[PDB]
Amino acid sequence: TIQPGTGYNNGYFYSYWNDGHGGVTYTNGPGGQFSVNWSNSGNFVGGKGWQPGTKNKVINFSGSYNPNGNSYLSVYGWSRNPLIEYYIVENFGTYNPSTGATKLGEVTSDGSVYDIYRTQRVNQPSIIGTATFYQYWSVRRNHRSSGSVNTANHFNAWAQQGLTLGTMDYQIVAVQGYFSSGSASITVS
Numbered sequence: 001t002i003q004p005g006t007g008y009n010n011g012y013f014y015s016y017w018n019d020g021h022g023g024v025t026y027t028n029g030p031g032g033q034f035s036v037n038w039s040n041s042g043n044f045v046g047g048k049g050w051q052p053g054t055k056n057k058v059i060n061f062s063g064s065y066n067p068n069g070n071s072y073l074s075v076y077g078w079s080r081n082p083l084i085e086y087y088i089v090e091n092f093g094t095y096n097p098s099t100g101a102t103k104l105g106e107v108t109s110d111g112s113v114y115d116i117y118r119t120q121r122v123n124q125p126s127i128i129g130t131a132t133f134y135q136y137w138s139v140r141r142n143h144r145s146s147g148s149v150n151t152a153n154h155f156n157a158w159a160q161q162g163l164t165l166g167t168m169d170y171q172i173v174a175v176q177g178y179f180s181s182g183s184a185s186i187t188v189s
């Protein structure tokens with residue numbers, strides 16, 4: 001179990017970030033494994049993967065995902081120039097992250113249709129400090145807690161709607177919670 005930060009563990013990059021609010025425990029396990037337990041958290045994002053990511057990675061994940069409230073399970077990462085926070089959301093709790101967002105299209109990948117959206121974060125935390133930036137979303141219709149994600153299928157679909165990615169920064173399978181509670185235990189490869 002560790003404090004917020006980034007690093008490398010057992011061959012995998014990890015990032016664990018929170019907004020300073022208590023109630024979250026993040027633990028790195030062997031290999032590509034991590035777990036998170038949270039109770040009345042604030043906002044946090046943690047998981048394992050790669051630094052940098054690539055635009056053609058096939059990401060495998062498996063384990064348990066037991067949110068109680070607002071939470072996401074996603075392939076999650078960033079680019080620079082442009083600065084983009086992106087999500088390929090495989091499962092979520094009580095809140096669909098695209099609520100209120102303008103849909104731009106659909107993509108079929110890895111056994112499901114996904115709906116695609118762009119949103120904007122204004123003056124928020126980011127990998128380069130406080131910033132305004134776009135977010136790109138693919139939201140899986142058929143929720144799951146194990147499988148493989150062909151990231152290129154999403155990135156290509158996004159590109160056809162002008163949702164351009166820059167040079168990749170990190171790319172993880174992330175568990176996110178937003179003022180909620182839950183448990184998750186995920187192995188990445």
Ligand SMILES: O[C@@H]1[C@@H](O)[C@H](O[C@@H]2CO[C@@H](O[C@@H]3CO[C@@H](O[C@@H]4CO[C@@H](O[C@@H]5CO[C@@H](O[C@@H]6CO[C@@H](O)[C@H](O)[C@H]6O)[C@H](O)[C@H]5O)[C@H](O)[C@H]4O)[C@H](O)[C@H]3O)[C@H](O)[C@H]2O)OC[C@H]1O
Binds near residue numbers: 128
């Ligand atoms: O040392 C630094 C290091 O700290 C830095 O790390 C970066 C910092 O930025 C991180 O990026 C964060 C990650 O979180 C991203 O999350 C956002 C949070 O907002 C979410 O939207 C919210 C969704 O819930 C909505 O509320 C609902 C409303 O309906 C109700 O019924 C329901 O109960 C309720 O929950 C809410 O209104 C809404 O605002 C959004 O979905 C989500 O994407 C965030 O964008 C981003 O800022 C990054 O992870 C770290 O790596 O790196 C640099 C070092 O120098």
